[PDB]
Amino acid sequence: EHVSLHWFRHGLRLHDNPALLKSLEGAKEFYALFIWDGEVAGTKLVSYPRMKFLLECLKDLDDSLKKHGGRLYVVKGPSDVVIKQLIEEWGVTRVTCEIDPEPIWQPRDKAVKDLCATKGVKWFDYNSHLLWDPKAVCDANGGRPPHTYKLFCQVTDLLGKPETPHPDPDFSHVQMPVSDDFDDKFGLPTLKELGCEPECEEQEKPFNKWQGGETGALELLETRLMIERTAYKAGYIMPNQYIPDLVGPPRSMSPHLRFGALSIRKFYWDLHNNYAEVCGGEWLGALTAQLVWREYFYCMSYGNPSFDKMEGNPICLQIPWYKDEEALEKWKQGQTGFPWIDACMRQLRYEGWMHHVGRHAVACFLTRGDLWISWVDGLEAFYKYMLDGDWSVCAGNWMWVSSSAFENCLQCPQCFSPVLYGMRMDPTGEFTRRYVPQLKNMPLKYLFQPWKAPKEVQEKAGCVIGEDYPSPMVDHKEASSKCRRMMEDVKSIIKDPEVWHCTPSDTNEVRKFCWLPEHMTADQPC
Amino acid sequence: EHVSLHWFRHGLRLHDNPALLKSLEGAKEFYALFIWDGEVAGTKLVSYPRMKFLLECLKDLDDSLKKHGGRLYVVKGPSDVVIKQLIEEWGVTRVTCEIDPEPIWQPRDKAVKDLCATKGVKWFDYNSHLLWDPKAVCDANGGRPPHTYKLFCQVTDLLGKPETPHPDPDFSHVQMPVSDDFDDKFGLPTLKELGCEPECEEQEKPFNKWQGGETGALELLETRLMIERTAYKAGYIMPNQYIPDLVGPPRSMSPHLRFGALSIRKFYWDLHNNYAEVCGGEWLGALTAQLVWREYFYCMSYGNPSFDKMEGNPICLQIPWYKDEEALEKWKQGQTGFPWIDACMRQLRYEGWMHHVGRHAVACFLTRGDLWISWVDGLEAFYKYMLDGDWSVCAGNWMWVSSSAFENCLQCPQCFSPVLYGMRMDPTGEFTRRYVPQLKNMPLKYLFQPWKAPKEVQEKAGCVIGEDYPSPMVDHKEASSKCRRMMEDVKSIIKDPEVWHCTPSDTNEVRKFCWLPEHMTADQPC
Ligand SMILES: Cc1cc2nc3c(=O)[nH]c(=O)nc-3n(C[C@H](O)[C@H](O)[C@H](O)COP(=O)(O)OP(=O)(O)OC[C@H]3O[C@@H](n4cnc5c(N)ncnc54)[C@H](O)[C@@H]3O)c2cc1C
Ligand SMILES: Cc1cc2nc3c(=O)[nH]c(=O)nc-3n(C[C@H](O)[C@H](O)[C@H](O)COP(=O)(O)OP(=O)(O)OC[C@H]3O[C@@H](n4cnc5c(N)ncnc54)[C@H](O)[C@@H]3O)c2cc1C
Ligand SMILES: [Mg+2]
Ligand SMILES: [Mg+2]
């Protein structure tokens, strides 16, 4: 005895969706809706790659719904008017949705609820995007979010464990009306009208291909689980990670987690059950350690709309930065003069995805390594091009890498160098040569230092530095010393080391974060 | 109206076994048998690792049979008497088996058939170990086996395609009698009585762990197929292989193929069906190119008992080798003085498995690179320690790498060097340091050349060359020139380049065989 409506904003899936399950029980009619308003799902500041991903996900969702005998409605316009129009037209009595924990989505929702309060329309919301409730974690640690990963783990180890996934829905006993001339009015838009077209030939035909949806997410999860099972049988339980693979398929699910095409609880429990089936029945929490950084960065933004800025944000230190547009433009385009940085930036601009080590390298190069430019300026590029540009996680990582004044392990000019780090992470040079073809014939000895090669080598390789490939934009030795002095001044000004701010816990945490050995080794420069 | 007996020698499996399926139709009783005679399945010249693998496979087979209500009989003694005893005791009327294509297993079988001819006992055999019949291939190319891989492919492309796998058996309508006190008389032996015990502490606790059986083979096949599916979706169809992974799990099925725990036809067809499901319905023969080298080397031994020797073998060239026992013992133990060679040899002696590049490197070092010692001497070690020491494939690979006088690409001292090749295949040095702990603290600069380091570096690293780690056993520059001169003399003596002998087809085949680029590159020494 209800006419229910489920609103799709995130969580574009049908598995493990309690809010959807609640809209089918005691329901005479059912409608599925998505509203295109220009701000939902990071559409305001976006580019071609992630638009393709979003459209593919929506098409997959509609195709999945067509099996049970239903369609997905897409409407263009403000939510506060679209909802009212649909209520007055269809005759809706109940609206169900999933919660958006970020503070920038709150005033949107508060407007709808009030409306439903003045028309006798029930409202239902359920949190299925995170493992723990941010408010409970904040209350357990006084009234402020934890500022350390170890403290966050300690706090969450007392609240309990996540809940198991829910079953799948059933549409057999519910009517799902569909209007005539549906594809002409409630159909899905196209990139041709929205104004997003490829900016270069590399976007049209990238080296690595991505597909959005839910079936691909489930297949990737199955492949991940069986790879781990085979590794466990071989004898590899949580081994040290030192050699990243940059020339093969990524096999990543972060873009799917961002949009909600895969459940976090399902992944969490599948990992542990897979481990227990093979080995004994002892609990090992190190398996799901990566999934806890995501929650640690999500819960930190609770109650702070200025979490993406340096001014007015109480959990960030104030640091005097510089502003030069030429350097920033060179960094964004990929004309810095260091092949390791340029390759990663061009990969981001073409495909929209990058490995962790590259992101750390480019962030350190921009902020506290050589140039001394604010992280707010570089965060915009990641918001614009990344496939998984979460509003809170990216800003949290930027503030973690930079602005940590009292951590001296991140200020070393030898370990975090745009030459030695690239040599370590790409001994062969195939990744560098793939995205910088100008240095295809350059010997591996001078591949990362093209300006130290003689003229005969340049002529033979067909790359004269200064005409075919730009000269370096800065001297690392000189820039590093002045940046170190400037940060030492910041430390002197901020006397107390125990201030409340986002920072790493210890040095080993940094070394593991950056894929480097903990103890001293014979291959450690300074 | 029969009492059938299936004899297990190879093909220790229940899936895709036509001979087994034939012993169940029209049968009143059924017996499964394995005879331990001291020569079956490479038991005469064997060590602890492969014995463990064989025993695990037999235990898995017995456990699988116990589900349907049957056991596996194991008897110790000569086959020609055991078969007769069992025929006179049980009352057998039909014997079924699988064919062993190698010529060393023929006189064993010819004795049994004759017996069955004088007692009214039917005999049935079926070839399920190979994809093509060696006799048909030999007849299609005159009366001799093809001596080139391209010629073998050309010949086999006209015979047709392999047959699809057969169904699984059923034991419901067949009686499977079991005797009392079974575990006391027909039980499985143990390594404790056979005389195989670990020779060192590294055998007891190896770094990589192996398990024999059929379930593991099927799981490995599933993992392989889904990895390939994901790679195809990403956009990687038959890419160039240049970076081997030596610090992770092997994920190999060659030992299972050797003993017959996995079918070759099933793998062949699963690969192609997996490819067709994702991509279009066009045939691509490059997918199963590795499975054809195995058949090429198997069919070459047809009609030649001396295929494992240099004297009396018509498909091998006669070359004057040297004989020094000290050098051979150093090569076998792993005291050569070159860490790249020692690590691979110690890995073989501990675990029993090695990557292709290491096998090629050590074979070239022994035979035609530096020492000039016969391949027959080194083949014995591989027969003794390898988990997949096939009688014909290993000898064929040895004769392919060595004795190819007219192929000058394999005679280059720069590309196939025990220093540069190791640097190329192990840029980090983790694999080398895992099996040569004496050089754990040695800098990566001198890791592959410990004798060129100063004394202070040796003292700091705690490795004085000559006392803690042996000095090099030979000078590569001098050895290479004399070996080249000696092989040039062989070429001068053997005038005709078109002699009938096992040899590579072209230079690109060698370069791909050894995981090296085809065209010239800036990182090519000579
Ligand atoms: C400057 C910078 C910005 C980043 N921005 C993002 C972002 O917007 N979104 C994002 O998901 N990751 C972000 N990361 C973390 C990291 O770059 C990605 O999580 C990485 O690409 C995951 O790849 P993977 O799935 O193969 O790793 P895996 O370890 O195989 O994936 C496990 C999962 O754990 C989570 N995870 C792992 N590391 C982190 C981390 N440091 N912070 C948060 N979650 C993590 C992700 O959901 C990931 O899918 C950023 C890192 C840096 C240095
Ligand atoms: C001196 C020497 C001796 C060798 N002895 C053997 C041996 O006794 N048994 C053996 O199976 N391989 C042998 N090989 C080939 C090679 O070393 C192994 O096939 C390799 O370990 C296969 O690993 P993989 O399964 O990961 O390779 P994959 O390519 O992933 O395996 C595909 C399959 O193709 C077959 N195959 C691949 N290459 C060859 C080859 N060159 N010759 C024959 N079959 C091949 C194997 O059955 C293998 O399982 C030898 C090579 C050399 C240089
Ligand atoms: Mg992932
Ligand atoms: Mg294999």
Numbering used by the authors:
A (entry chain B), B (entry chain A): 31 to 556
Text of the article:
We were able to refine the subset of particles composed of two subunits to obtain a dimeric structure with the PdLCry subunits arranged in parallel. As we did not observe any asymmetry during the reconstruction procedure, we enforced C2 symmetry in later reconstruction stages, yielding a final cryo-EM density map at 2.6 Å resolution. The main dimer interface is formed between helices α8 of both subunits, with helices α8 running antiparallel at an angle of 42 degrees, flanked by interactions mediated by the connector region and the PBL. Apart from the differences in helix α8, we note unique dimer interactions involving Tyr266 of the PBL, especially with Pro279 (PBL) and Asn238 (connector) from the other subunit. A chain of four tryptophan residues, comprising TrpA428, TrpB405, TrpC351, and TrpD402, lines the path from the FAD to the protein surface and occupies identical positions as observed in the archetypical type I CRY DmCry.
Cryptochromes (CRYs) are a structurally conserved but functionally diverse family of proteins that can confer unique sensory properties to organisms. The α-helical region contains the binding pocket for the major chromophore, flavin adenine dinucleotide (FAD), which is required for the light response.
